[PDB]
C-alpha cells in the first residue's frame, strides 16, 4: 500500500486538484475559442486540444478509481464527474452527441465550491440547498396545473390551428409560452378571438392562477432567509 | 468496408456506408448514426 | 340497515376510494391519448372508453347518494364532484358542451389531497387557503380600477380604431393586455401616438397604479408565512 | 338657523348620502352603456341622462356649500368632489374636454371608503396610505435616473432614427419602454446593433440599474406590513 | 497660508458649493435644450455654452486641487468628479467622445446627496449601499451561469443561423434576451423548432434556473430592511 | 324523423334536422343545438 | 351669428364659425375651440 | 496643413486630412480619429 498511499497523497494534493480546476477553466476558454472566424487549419489543433483535454480528464478519473472502489461512488459529486467524462467518452465512441460533451463545462461549477468564500454566499448556498425540495414540490403542483389546462386546451383548440395546440407536446409548450407573459395577446389570443370569441374566458383565469403559483414560489424562496437569520 | 474509429476527411468521406457511418466535419471521423 | 352499512363500509374502504382515484388518473391519461395522429377506427374505442369512464363516475355518485341524503350535500367537495359529473352527463344529454366534460379532469385535484404529505406543502396549502379571502378583495379593488379606467378608455379611443376599444368588452380586454406589460408599446400605444399625441399621459400612470396594485397583491401573499411561523 | 340645521341633517342623513353613491354607481353603469351598437335615437336619452346626472351632482355640491363656507374646503376630499364636478361643468361650458368629464367616475372610489370593512383591507389601506411618501421619493429618484439616461440617449442616437430618440419627449418615452422589458431586443436594440455595435453596453447596465431600483420599490412596499404587525 | 485658507474657506462656502450644483442642474437643462428643432445659428451659442460650462467645471477642479494635493485624492468622490471633467476635457482634446462628455450629467447625482433628507430615503440609501457587495456576488454567479450556457448555445446553434448564435458576443446577448422573457417564443425558439425539435429542452430549464437566480437576487435585496429594522 | 340519443356517423348524418340536431364528429351522435 | 350654449346637430351645424365653434357629434352643441 | 485645435465649419472642412482630422458638425473643430 506504499505507492498506493504516496501517489494517493499526490492526488489529494491541492496543487494537483487545483491544477485540474485550472485545466477545467482553460478547457472552457478553449471552448470560448469556438468562433466562426476560426480557420480550418487551426480547427485541427482545436480538435487535438479537445482530445488531450478529455484525455487529461480520463486520466484523472482512472486515478480516482484506482484509489477508490465504492467510497467515491457513494459520493454523488464524484458520480457526477465520472458520469460526465464518460459521456464525453461516448462522444469519443461514435455516438451522436450534439454538444453534450461540453456538459463537462459544468465541471467549472467546482469553482462554485470556491466562490462560497464570500460571507454572503455562504448564506446564499445554504439557502439554495435548503429550498431545493420545496421548489421541487411546487414544480410538481404547477406541472399538474399545466397538465390539466393543456389537456383542456388541446381538446378545445385543436382543429382550426394545430401549430399551437395540435398535439399535447406543442399545446403544452404553448401554455408555457402563455405562462411567461409573452405575445399571448398579439401572437396567440387575438388570433383565437378572430375565430372563437369565448377563449379569453379560458386564458385570463389561467394567467391569474399561474401568476398566483409563481408568486407563491417567490414566497417560498423568501422564507429561507428569515428561517436562517 | 472501412472500419470503426478510422481517421478521414468529410470532403472525401469513405466510411462503411452500410453501417450508417459518415465522416463528420467537426470530428473528422466516421460517426455511428 | 344491514347491507346499507356493509356496502357503505365498502364505499368508505380506501381500496375502493383510491381505486376511484386510479380510475381518475387513468381517465386523464385517456384524455392524454388525445393526439391528432389517432386513427378514426381507434377513435371509437376512445369514445366507448369515455362512455365507460363516465359510467363508472356516475355509478360512484349514485352509490354516494344512496348512502347520503343531505349529509354529503352539506360538504361542498361532494357537491363539486356531483356537479362536474352531472355536467358530464349533460354532455351525455345532447348539449353543446365544448370541452367542459373534461372539467372532470379537475377531479384529479383530489390527488392534491394526497400531495400535502410533504411537510412544506402542509404550510403551503394552509397558506393558500388562508390567503383566498384577501386575494378576493384585491381582485375586487383591481377590477374596480379596471372598470373606471376602461370606461375612460372606451370613451376616449373608440373612434379611430374600435378593434381595441370599440365596446367595453374588448376595451376591457385591451387594458388587461396593457396590464401584463406585453406589446403596449409596439402593438398598442405607438399606433395611438400615430394619431393622438397625448395618450401616453393616460397609459403611463395606469401602468404605475396597477404595477402598484399587483405588487401589493404579492405583499399580501407574503404576509401569511410570517403570520403562521 | 332652523331650516339650516334641519335640511343640513337631511344632508348628513345616510339615506341621502348613500343615495348619492347609488346615483354614482348608476352613473357609471350609465357610462357602461357606452356601446358602439347603441342607436342614434337612443343616444339622445343617454345625453339627457348625462345632463340630469351632472345636474344631480351639481345640486349636491350647491347644497354642500350652502351649508359649509370653508369648513368643507379644508377637507381635500370635498375639494376633490367639487373640483371634478366643476370640471364636468366646464365640459358643460363649451370646452374641449375629451373624456375628462367621466373623471367623475373616480367618485365611485367613495365606495372604496366602504370596501375597507373587510378586516384585511383595513391593514391594506393603512399600508397604502403609509407607503405613499416613500414611493413619491423613489419616483423622484427613478425619474432622475431616467432624466440623465434619456439625455445621454437623445444625444447619442438622435441622428439615424429620431422616431425613438429625436426629441427628449420621445426618447424619454422610449426609455420607459425599455424599462418595462418589452421589445427592447427585437423592436429596439437589434436595429441599433444594425448600425451602432456598441449600444448594448449602454442598454444592459440601464436594465440592471432600473431593475435594481424597481425591486427596491418592491422592498419599500414590503416593509409596511412588518412595520405594522 | 493666509489667502490659501481664506479662499479655501470661500471654496468650502455652501454658497459656492451649492452654486456649483446650480450650475450643474442648469447644465443638464442646457442639455435638455438638445432638441432637433433647434436652429443652426442658435446651435453655436449652445456650443459656447457647453464650452463655458466645462470651463466653470475645470476652474472648480483646478481650485480644488490648488487646495488639496492627495487629501481629496484619497476620497473617491473627488476622484469621480475629477475623472469625469477630465474626460470632458479629452472631449475637448480632439478625441472621438460619442457622448461620454455628458457623463458629467452624472454630477447631478450630488443632488442625490441632498435627496436623502426624506426620512425613508436615509434607510433607502443605507440599504442600497449595504446591498452593493452581495449583488456584485450574485452578478458574478449569474454571469458564470450565462457563460457556460452561452458556450453550450454557441456550439449548438451556430450553423443554421449565426445572427443570434454565431459568435460568443451575440450568443451571449441572445441569452440575455431570453433571460428577460421577451420574444423567446415568437422571435427565437419557434424558429429553432422549425429546424431543431429538441431545443426547447435546452431553453426551458434555462428559464427556470435564471428565474430562480433573479428571484434570489430579489430576496437578498429584501433582507436588508429586516436587517436594519 | 330520427330520435334523440341515436348513434350515427358525421359523414352520413341523418338526425332530425328540424330540431337542430347534427351528428358530431367527436361524439358520433346527434347533439341538440 | 348663433350664440353660445345653443342646441344643434352636427349634421347641420350652424354655430358662430367666426369664434371657432362647431356642433360636436357627442355633445350636440357648439364647443369653443 | 491646418493645425490642431483650429476652429472651422463642417460644410467647408479644411483640417489636416493626412492626420485623419475632420471638422465635426457638433463640435465645429477638427477631431483626431
UniProtKB/Swiss-Prot annotation, chains B, F, G, H:
The record marks 5, 25-26, 29, 31 as: Binds to the extracellular loop of voltage sensor domain II of sodium channels (Nav1.2/SCN2A and Nav1.7/SCN9A). Changing residue 5 to A: Important decrease in ability to inhibit Nav1.2/SCN2A, and small decrease in ability to inhibit Nav1.7/SCN9A. Expressed by the venom gland. Disulfide bonds join 1-16, 8-23, 15-30. Two forms of huwentoxin-IV exist in the venom of H.schmidti, a non-N-terminally modified (HwTx-IV) and a naturally modified peptide with pyroglutamic acid residue at position 53 (mHwTx-IV). mHwTx-IV shows no observable difference with the unmodified toxin when applied to the TTX-S sodium channel of DRG neuron (IC(50)~50 nM) or when tested on hNav1.7/SCN9A (IC(50)=30.8 nM). In addition, similarly to the unmodified toxin, mHwTx-IV has only a weak affinity for lipid membranes. It is found in: Secreted. Changing residue 21 to A: Important decrease in ability to inhibit both Nav1.2/SCN2A and Nav1.7/SCN9A. Changing residue 31 to A: Almost complete loss in ability to inhibit both Nav1.2/SCN2A and Nav1.7/SCN9A. Changing residue 24 to A: Important decrease in ability to inhibit both Nav1.2/SCN2A and Nav1.7/SCN9A. Changing residue 26 to A: Important decrease in ability to inhibit Nav1.2/SCN2A, and no change in activity on Nav1.7/SCN9A. This lethal neurotoxin (without cyclization at position 53) inhibits neuronal voltage-gated sodium channel Nav1.2/SCN2A (IC(50)=10-150 nM), rNav1.3/SCN3A (IC(50)=338 nM), Nav1.6/SCN8A (IC(50)=117 nM), and hNav1.7/SCN9A (IC(50)=9.6-33 nM). It inhibits activation of sodium channel by trapping the voltage sensor of domain II (DIIS4) in the closed configuration. The toxin neither shifts the Nav1.7/SCN9A activation curve nor modifies the slope factor. It does not slow fast-inactivation of hNav1.7/SCN9A channels. In addition, it has only a weak affinity for lipid membranes. Belongs to the neurotoxin 10 (Hwtx-1) family. 22 (Htx-4) subfamily. Shows a weak or no inhibition on rNav1.4/SCN4A (IC(50)=3.9->10 uM) and hNav1.5/SCN5A sodium channels (IC(50)=>10-25 uM). This toxin has also been shown to weakly inhibit Kv11.1/KCNH2/ERG1, Kv1.2/KCNA2 and Kv1.3/KCNA3. The presence of a 'disulfide through disulfide knot' structurally defines this protein as a knottin. This is Huwentoxin-IV. It comes from Cyriopagopus schmidti (Chinese bird spider).
